[PDB]
Design a binder for this molecule. Structure first.
Ligand SMILES: *[C@@H]1O[C@H](CO)[C@@H](O)[C@H](O)[C@H]1NC(C)=O
Ligand SMILES: *[C@@H]1O[C@H](CO)[C@@H](O)[C@H](O)[C@H]1NC(C)=O
Ligand SMILES: *[C@@H]1O[C@H](CO)[C@@H](O)[C@H](O)[C@H]1NC(C)=O
Ligand SMILES: *[C@@H]1O[C@H](CO)[C@@H](O)[C@H](O)[C@H]1NC(C)=O
Lengths: 125, 404, 222, 32, 89, 81
């Protein structure tokens, strides 16, 4: 088409041809009306779950919060004895975080057991 | 007067031994007016054409009776021998835009007036005059209308994988017993499934808590996917649907014959590719197209909105798609020399203004588990018998071992 | 009402007879698995398997209730999903309702108005005499006055042209005003164009209008 | 304009993470 | 007294003679309906974007219908002014 | 917000009688051919609810587990004076 225009065989040409330095110098052109250019075409719950793309994208504040809340619960459970810390408190907490624990069981333990409400609220959220 | 066959508007039935039809009352209790109508037994070509008189009735004949009562008309009901609405078609003699079908019969002088669901068209209006429409309706499409995979929609091996997880904990509990039996696997199976089943206890508690949280997370992932997501599979949006705009042999759709829809498509030169595939799926009448759609021969059938919605109400297996396009209304077509145009228009307008059209609509137009859980119920019911049988077998085996 | 089809379980056919039979089957299998007490233990175990958190109730015979527990929890999850899918979201049903005949027979006095010197009043004059007489009490000076009266609660309904009411409902601020569903128009007619009788312009005006309708030039303007 | 579910691999990764955490916790019991 | 309330809350709040037990089992079963409804309501109110989903475009009803509650304008007599002045609708 | 409308391009304002218009157009086309505009865009233009409720609930529960406990302890002391 460009060669046809060059040798006076075509006064006007419209064939969706591109505009570059070489074509512009050889033959004149008017104001473009459609955006175009050089591009590359390739083939087009799938993303990551249980991680930053799913929830807790920053993945630091919540990560430390879920541990410090358990630490505070263990500390207050120890302080409420007047039971014990470390293994017993950790086992009790990890048993009360969910409502399907069988081997989990005056008023201090019952008062700490209200953390099951927080656990179920967190599960619902 | 000649009319065309249309189930929502013109019911045609064979006559009894006396040449008439049974006298019946509608659901509301009003009498069902029927008339003796002359026409061919089979309008399709290549058939033993017999002009036996059938019995025809419906909304159109009721409107005709009302018009005759208001204008002292002695109507003579006739049926279109061609069996089509008719338009300008080229059959022979080169350039010949001669009207055929009902329009051709009216122009030939055989018919004096037409009462039928005849869509108002500009080309028809050029040579015929249409009175005030008695109803307004457009064009839509008719098409036959998720959680069957109760276990897993895909990757069914997961049920095994989580089961393998039980193993990777069961053998664990034995090891702690050796460096401190047989119920570890049973408890692992029945910890989430409630059925009543020094540091070793702590490790057991933590490991089973992790297993339980993994299981509940998997169950939430599986079930929360089965949600409000659309159950229908890509319902036709309407005339602007890209699938309709891109004809293909995989998804075929066409009209019935050279009706007003065909004329509208002919005028719309944009859908040139649509016409090519449409011409290959024509049908003799609307009933054949409806049967084909019910038989899944046609993916979708484009036709008048009123007929399609009436058929959807009558046949719930087929549903209507598309909002509205080519909005028009049915009207009475008469020759330009007929002096009843003003009388017919006034009578129709008066009847529609006084609520007669509402009564006509009520009498004729206005009418009236699975693998989600039944599959798993059947599976568990079948498995219970095998389970109790094997329980009896193992009890007998234990008794034999104890006796020996 | 409650525990019916409107409440939940939009099918409501299979489960309402399935629950009793599955409970009976569970009782039978648990009383057969003694090598126990029917009322004292079978029903308790059935309730403990229907829902996870329950009362602490207890060979492979008692082990094999895991399949029933799994079926029950799957059924509960499916019920929750169905409730979630069903919880995501109109009484006149036309002019044939009894309210238009006896507006004053209800506890709240129904107040419907129209615009006189129009088509609606002319139609209702020759079709409903007493209804028109009651309507004359609530005459409106214009479309805007009736619209603001209906919006503010002064009027309970407004009968007028279908196209104008549809336009107002479609573009209403807040979408607090709606028409009588769809297709409930009493006297479905059209506007058209008025011409003098015997004029030679109708013969081509009608053809031009029908050509415009057929060519699709009307849809974009609408 | 006119012219022109269920779990995934990361769930298994989280399962691996929790299994590793459980093994790390149980190492203390094993050595004891 | 007081211990009975804690005992009942241990079942209601999932914290872990037959005449009372038969109705207690029904109460425990119904207690799960409350939490299921709470979870369903939270999911329904969380999956839906409560505020407006931004401006769709030129044909947005907010832009096509002027209102002091949602003001919108250009800066000055720039190219946007000429582009709008070209259109008449 | 908004996908796109009134798509156009930024132009170099020049007078009609200015003889540099063709040279400017050729230079711009040559520069954009090799990606100079892309490099300039990269160097100048191409630059870089749940938490709140979670924190509120965590604070509420950690406050309650102590406040309700001390209230119950005071009640026990009153009942066992
Ligand atoms: C038809 O209309 C004319 C004028 O409107 C009237 O004089 C005539 O009586 C009408 N025909 C019948 C049969 O009523
Ligand atoms: C109806 O009109 C016809 C005129 O064709 C007349 O002979 C007949 O008497 C009319 N019937 C009545 C009931 O007026
Ligand atoms: C309606 O017509 C009456 C005369 O019957 C007149 O008094 C009244 O002002 C008219 N109202 C309007 C809004 O034109
Ligand atoms: C434009 O570029 C050409 C390149 O050869 C040059 O000869 C010409 O002088 C330039 N135009 C002006 C006004 O300098």
């Amino acid at each position: 088409m460009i060669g046809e225009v060059v040798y006076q065989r075509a006064v006007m040409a419209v064939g969706s041809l591109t505009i570059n330095e070489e074509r512009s110098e050889v033959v004149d052109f008017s104001v473009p009306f459609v955006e175009t250019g050089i591009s590359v075409m390739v083939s087009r719950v799938s993303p990551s779950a249980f991680l930053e793309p799913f929830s807790a994208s920053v993945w630091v504040m919540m990560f430390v919060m879920l541990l410090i809340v358990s630490a505070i619960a263990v500390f207050v459970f120890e302080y409420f004895s007047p039971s014990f810390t470390i293994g017993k408190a950790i086992w009790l907490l990890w048993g009360l975080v969910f409502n399907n624990s069988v081997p989990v069981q005056t008023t201090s333990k019952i008062m700490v057991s209200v953390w099951a409400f927080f656990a179920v609220i967190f599960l619902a959220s | 007067i000649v009319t065309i066959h249309q189930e929502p508007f013109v019911y045609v039935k064979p006559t009894l031994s006396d040449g008439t039809c049974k006298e019946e009352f509608t659901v509301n209790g009003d009498p069902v007016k029927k008339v003796i109508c002359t026409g061919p037994n089979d309008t399709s070509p290549g058939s033993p054409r017999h002009t036996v008189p059938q019995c025809c009735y419906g909304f159109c004949i009721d409107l005709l009776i009302k018009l005759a009562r208001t204008m002292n008309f002695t109507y003579e009901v006739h049926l279109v021998a061609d069996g089509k609405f008719g338009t300008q078609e080229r059959v022979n003699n080169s350039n010949k835009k001669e009207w055929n079908g009902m329009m051709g019969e009216l122009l030939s002088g055989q018919a004096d007036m037409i009462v039928a669901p005849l869509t108002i068209n500009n080309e028809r209006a050029q040579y015929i005059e249409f009175s005030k429409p008695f109803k307004y309706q457009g064009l839509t499409i008719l098409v036959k209308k998720t959680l069957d995979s109760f276990m897993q929609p895909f990757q069914s091996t997961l049920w095994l994988l989580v089961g393998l997880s039980v193993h990777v904990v069961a053998v664990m509990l034995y090891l702690l017993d050796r460096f401190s039996l047989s119920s570890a696997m049973w408890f692992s199976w029945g910890v989430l499934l409630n059925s009543g089943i020094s540091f070793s206890a702590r490790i057991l508690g933590m490991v089973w808590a992790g297993f339980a949280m993994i299981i509940v997370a998997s169950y939430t992932a599986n079930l929360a996917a089965f949600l409000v997501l659309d159950r229908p599979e890509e319902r036709i949006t309407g005339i602007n649907d890209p699938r309709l705009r891109n004809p293909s042999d995989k998804f075929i759709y066409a009209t019935v014959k050279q009706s007003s829809v065909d004329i509208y498509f002919r005028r719309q030169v944009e859908l040139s590719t649509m016409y090519r595939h449409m011409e290959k799926h024509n049908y003799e009448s609307a009933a054949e197209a409806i049967q084909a759609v019910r038989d899944n021969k046609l993916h979708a059938f484009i036709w008048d909105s009123a007929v399609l919605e009436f058929e959807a109400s009558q046949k719930c297996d087929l549903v209507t798609t598309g909002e509205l396009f080519f909005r028009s209304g049915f009207g009475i077509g008469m020759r330009k020399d007929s002096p009843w145009k003003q009388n017919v228009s006034l009578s129709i307008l008066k009847s529609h203004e006084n609520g007669f059209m509402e009564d006509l609509d009520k009498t004729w137009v206005r009418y009236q588990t699975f693998e989600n859980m039944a599959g798993v119920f059947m599976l568990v019911a079948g498995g219970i018998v095998a389970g109790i049988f094997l329980i009896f077998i193992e009890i007998a085996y234990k008794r034999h071992k104890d006796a020996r | 009402s409650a525990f019916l089809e409107p409440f939940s379980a939009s099918v409501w056919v299979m489960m309402f007879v399935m629950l009793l039979i599955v409970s009976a089957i569970a009782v039978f299998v648990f009383e057969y698995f003694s090598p126990s007490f029917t009322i004292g233990k079978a029903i308790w175990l059935l309730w403990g398997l229907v829902f996870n958190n329950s009362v602490p109730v207890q060979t492979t015979s008692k082990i094999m209730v895991s399949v029933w527990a799994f079926f029950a929890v799957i059924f509960l999850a499916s019920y929750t999903a169905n409730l979630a899918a069903f919880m995501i979201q109109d009484q006149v049903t036309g002019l044939s309702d009894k309210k238009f005949q006896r507006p004053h027979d209800y506890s709240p006095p129904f107040r419907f108005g129209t615009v006189p010197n129009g088509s609606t009043e002319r139609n209702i004059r020759n079709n409903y005499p007493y209804m028109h007489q009651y309507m004359t009490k609530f005459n409106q000076k214009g479309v805007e006055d009736a619209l603001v009266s209906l919006k503010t609660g002064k009027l309970d309904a407004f009968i007028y042209d279908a196209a104008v009411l549809n336009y107002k409902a479609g573009r209403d601020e807040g979408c607090k005003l709606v028409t009588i569903g769809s297709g409930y128009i009493f006297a479905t007619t059209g506007y058209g164009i008025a011409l003098q009788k015997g004029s030679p312009w109708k013969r081509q005006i009608d053809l031009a209008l029908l050509q415009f309708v057929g060519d699709g030039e009307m849809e974009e303007l609408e | 304009t006119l012219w022109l579910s269920q779990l995934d691999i990361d769930n298994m990764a989280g399962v691996f993470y929790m299994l590793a955490a459980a093994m790390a916790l149980s190492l203390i019991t094993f050595i004891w």
